[PDB]
Amino acid sequence: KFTKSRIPDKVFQPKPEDHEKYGGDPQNPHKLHIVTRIRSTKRRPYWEKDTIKMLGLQKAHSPQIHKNIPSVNAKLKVVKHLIRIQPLKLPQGLPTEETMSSTCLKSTGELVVQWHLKPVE
Amino acid sequence: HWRVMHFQRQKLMAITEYIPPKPAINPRCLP
Amino acid sequence: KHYGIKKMEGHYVHAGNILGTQRQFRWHPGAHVGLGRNKCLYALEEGIVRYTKDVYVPNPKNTEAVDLVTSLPKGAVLYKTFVHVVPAKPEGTFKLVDML
Amino acid sequence: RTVSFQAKESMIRRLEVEAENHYWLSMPYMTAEQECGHAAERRAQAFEAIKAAATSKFPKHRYIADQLDHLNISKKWS
Amino acid sequence: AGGQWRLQQGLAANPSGYGPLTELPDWSFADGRPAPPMKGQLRRKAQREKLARRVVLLTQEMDAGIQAWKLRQQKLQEERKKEHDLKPKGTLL
RNA sequence: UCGGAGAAAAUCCUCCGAAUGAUUAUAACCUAGACUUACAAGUCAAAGUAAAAAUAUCUUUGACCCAGAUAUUUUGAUCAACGGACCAAGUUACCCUAGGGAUAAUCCUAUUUAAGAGUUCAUAUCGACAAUUAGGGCUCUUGGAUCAGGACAUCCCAAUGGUGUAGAAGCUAUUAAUGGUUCGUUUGUUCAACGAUUAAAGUCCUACGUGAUCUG
RNA sequence: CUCUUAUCUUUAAUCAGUGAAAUUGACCUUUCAGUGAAGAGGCUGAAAUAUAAUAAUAAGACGAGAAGACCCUAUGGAGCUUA
RNA sequence: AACGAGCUUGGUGAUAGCUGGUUACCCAAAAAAUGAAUUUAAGUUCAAUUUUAAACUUGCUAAAAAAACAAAAUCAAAAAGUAAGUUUAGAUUAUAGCCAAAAGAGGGCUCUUCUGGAACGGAAAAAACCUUUAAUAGUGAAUAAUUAACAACAUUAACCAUUGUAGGCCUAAAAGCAGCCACCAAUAAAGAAAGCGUUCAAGCUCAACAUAAAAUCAAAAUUCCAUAAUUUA
RNA sequence: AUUAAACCUUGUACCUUUUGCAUAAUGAACUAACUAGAAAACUUCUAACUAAAAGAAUUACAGCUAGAAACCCCGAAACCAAAC
Ligand SMILES: [Mg+2]
Ligand SMILES: [Mg+2]
Ligand SMILES: [Mg+2]
Ligand SMILES: [Mg+2]
Ligand SMILES: [Mg+2]
Ligand SMILES: [Mg+2]
Ligand SMILES: [Mg+2]
Ligand SMILES: [Mg+2]
Ligand SMILES: [Mg+2]
Ligand SMILES: [Mg+2]
Ligand SMILES: [Mg+2]
Ligand SMILES: [Mg+2]
Ligand SMILES: [Mg+2]
Ligand SMILES: [Mg+2]
Ligand SMILES: [Mg+2]
Ligand SMILES: [Mg+2]
Ligand SMILES: [Mg+2]
Ligand SMILES: [Mg+2]
Ligand SMILES: [Mg+2]
Ligand SMILES: [Mg+2]
Ligand SMILES: [Mg+2]
Ligand SMILES: [Mg+2]
Ligand SMILES: [Mg+2]
Ligand SMILES: [Mg+2]
Ligand SMILES: [Mg+2]
């Protein structure tokens, strides 16, 4: 009988080579996830359909911001095959009330707070 | 008679087949 | 039919609620829990249900239990499962009725 | 059957993405205990909004203006 | 065509995404007066502001929740070391 | 119809039992809270009151209506088709209407293996034990005439290898679909036989090949 | 019947006159292999292919009209016999 | 003209749980087809589901330990992601499914249990496999699934053969060879012999004598059926 | 779509019934006219008056009075009475 399954814990314990490859220090972990749906929920079990609606990932190829805390992570593991996770990055600092209206998110995962649409020169 | 495998399962077997490493120089032609 | 545990451990139970049904003595009455002639178990007080293991000692008069109990080896004694309910309220309080 | 070249590659590319998903899920910022209670205030306010909308149903006002405006249907140039 | 190369340079995969070609105004009056903002651009601006405000809110709660926890840690710590009264001994206490 | 045991929450699945009996120092009334359950029916029980000096254990049937009994409380079903019509069986090919359907085993062939047959000698000719992602065939639609299309797993005609091939006859295997492949008859014979011939009287597929071409 | 042949009359065919019937979703109405409900003029892949009449054959259109028969059901019927 | 029981009118709009039909637009929501009783299984009533309205308050996912089980279904603290849930009033329809993928049970069917599906793209045509959040105009753009895939090899080939004696044994004889036990001998080198073959014997080989050299599994019945192609980053 | 009627590309008639499926099987030669959902016990909505409402007989511990809102067509074999 096809049923819900539990992943072994070892999968989520990284290795030193992985840190080099993906470039994340096991210290100073990032805070905010960027998640996008890149597959469909049709032909999948109902538990996966419900979670995708809980996380706000109804439209494909639209990014959603979530917390990197254990309770949220428990839900993301269920639908790991249907989504893409990228860590958020703030090169120029968190946006303030002044810059709230000029932010723009790049494909790399960087939330720049100034967007002028001009050559860098 | 071998029961046919779901095409998804067949795709899994094709990608996980054993690959051996090959030497740069054949031993016989070496001194 | 549907023999089983009607009330599971850790549930608030009112007086008279039936906790378990059984053809034979899988569980035994404990504290503030009574016996029905059909051997069902009901709560005699308002409180929380608990299941605990405990030593079993039979009435002296009954022969079958005494015979088995004495025949046990010196090392250890047999155990059983018991059901108890922990009362959760004070039965009463004193209040001022009149000033004379 | 024989699995085509396209099918083998497309599957590999999807495997590689999921491998990175495993990595980024291995470094929680906050432990379980630190999380407890950190968002209680916001959650409680949200339900209060939901309850208020539920218990707000009632009929609508009726005005003399609506009824008497029907007479303008027979307006004319005298 | 060219989606992967575009991403490597840091741009969007689809040239119809963020960038000067799409976002900049398409026309202006011959006099020089600016045209009214395009409806699509106004919707795009609102969506980004909504996302940024969520980022601020989520971070603050997480930071505020870390400190509140360690402050509680102390209160338990000092409470543990406590004493009162006196400690006699012998044949009378 | 109801209960018990296995399968294990399915079954026309595998089994046993029940429509009670024995002993009872005689088991009241009243009433919180629960189980079980479509409905109906069925279980357990604190406190209070009352008799006594608290529970009888063994462990399984039947609604309503309608008739009883007596001095007000009680009693009536193999209604067993067991949610139960107060009381009714056969037969129809003489038949009618409304509709719904319809109309693995075996066995032989080919490959692998090779104890034993063959005077001697495994494989001229056969051949146990087996092996074969091997082929293909208590019961109850076919013939014939006419005209044929096609397969080769070949009966005859043709080209070849081996032989326990002297000649003549034969036995076995390879290649090939060219055209052909008869006429009469039932005493007995569980899908058989008989007479006279032929170079030969092949095995099969084609909704009995073929009934808007015919017929038993 | 082996084994069929010849002639005449009726029918048939051409001209003149009068003039029906069952039938009919629309049709600009092809062959082979495959797919499929033993099933394809219309679907997939190949191939063939100026347009219309007159006279013939009956393989297919699961060809048309069948008050044609066998099996089952209904708290639908009727005839007959009784214990 | 139509008798297993005439014909006509009326009772009569007989009855039919069965067959056929049931006439404008738009928006919104939505089923399963499980359980129980029935002269019931071609039908109906109740539960369960769905649904419209109303009152007011917690629901869904998750869920530690500690139980109850025997050695994944209950149960539901605290949190977190999130917007439903209970009670009251009214109302029908429905009560046979189909294929794929798992686990069993009676042995290909037949039941029971968990998951998924109903393209306008793809797999040749293609209800059930795969990609796919609704539906609109445009001679814009980035992508998803996507019947094809690239017959051998990786211990030997060269030269030879003398003898104690034909080893015992009812076996005539059984001589290396039917057996049957022993199995020794000379010589550089020779098994009382690894095979053939002799009525037994003869005879042919093998191993020995010197002399040389090489070096495991696997990529049938109408008439064939896209066309073709081995190298440009 | 096109400069161009046909050539090129795309496309398995309709209703009903079946398991949400038809190259299955019912029904249709075409035109015009005719040819099939009907009731107010309870509920909801809109008003009048209100411890009372109603133009006599009825209901009432906010009720009572009035309005509006609803449930098809065609088709047997038979049975009985009286004539012919
Ligand atoms: Mg008592
Ligand atoms: Mg009955
Ligand atoms: Mg019954
Ligand atoms: Mg007769
Ligand atoms: Mg022929
Ligand atoms: Mg041949
Ligand atoms: Mg015919
Ligand atoms: Mg004429
Ligand atoms: Mg034509
Ligand atoms: Mg065909
Ligand atoms: Mg075609
Ligand atoms: Mg024909
Ligand atoms: Mg004719
Ligand atoms: Mg016909
Ligand atoms: Mg019936
Ligand atoms: Mg009757
Ligand atoms: Mg009758
Ligand atoms: Mg009628
Ligand atoms: Mg069901
Ligand atoms: Mg009955
Ligand atoms: Mg019925
Ligand atoms: Mg909770
Ligand atoms: Mg029919
Ligand atoms: Mg017709
Ligand atoms: Mg008309």
Side-chain angles (χ1 to χ4, degrees), chain C residues 17-85:
Chain C
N17 279 29
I18 292 179
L19 309 162
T21 42
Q22 66 211 12
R23 169 173 312 87
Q24 297 200 15
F25 278 97
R26 294 186 66 238
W27 313 284
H28 283 255
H32 293 132
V33 167
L35 269 175
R37 303 160 165 189
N38 66 344
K39 289 188 284 189
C40 85
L41 300 176
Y42 62 106
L44 295 162
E45 290 294 1
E46 204 164 313
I48 307 290
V49 184
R50 300 283 178 199
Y51 296 108
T52 67
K53 276 76 67 170
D54 201 85
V55 306
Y56 170 93
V57 288
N59 209 15
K61 287 199 276 189
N62 65 0
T63 77
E64 70 287 26
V66 173
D67 313 323
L68 179 68
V69 169
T70 187
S71 61
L72 267 296
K74 182 179 179 180
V77 308
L78 59 87
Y79 285 72
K80 297 290 201 284
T81 304
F82 287 74
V83 183
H84 325 273
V85 73

Side-chain angles (χ1 to χ4, degrees), chain E residues 4-70:
Chain E
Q4 301 303 60
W5 177 90
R6 281 191 188 91
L7 275 174
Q8 284 181 346
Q9 319 310 106
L11 300 159
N14 189 352
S16 294
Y18 65 74
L21 187 52
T22 66
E23 294 187 354
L24 294 179
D26 283 0
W27 61 274
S28 76
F29 297 83
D31 304 340
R33 308 151 38 210
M38 305 213 295
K39 317 278 176 43
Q41 191 63 56
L42 299 183
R43 165 170 49 78
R44 224 167 293 130
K45 274 159 50 188
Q47 294 176 352
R48 274 91 67 85
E49 168 164 331
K50 182 162 198 160
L51 181 135
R53 292 192 180 274
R54 177 178 175 86
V55 163
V56 174
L57 174 52
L58 298 176
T59 51
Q60 285 175 349
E61 277 198 2
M62 274 203 297
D63 295 335
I66 293 179
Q67 179 195 241
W69 161 85
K70 70 194 57 174

Side-chain angles (χ1 to χ4, degrees), chain A residues 83-99:
Chain A
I83 60 163
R84 192 198 176 214
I85 305 177
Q86 271 192 308
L88 179 63
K89 294 187 302 182
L90 295 144
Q92 319 173 340
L94 270 170
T96 80
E97 169 57 17
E98 169 174 341
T99 53

Side-chain angles (χ1 to χ4, degrees), chain A residues 34-51:
Chain A
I34 316 183
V35 293
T36 43
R37 186 169 68 78
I38 59 164
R39 285 177 81 227
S40 173
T41 58
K42 302 189 206 176
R43 308 173 184 275
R44 301 304 320 179
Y46 67 84
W47 48 86
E48 313 192 11
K49 289 192 171 91
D50 298 15
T51 60

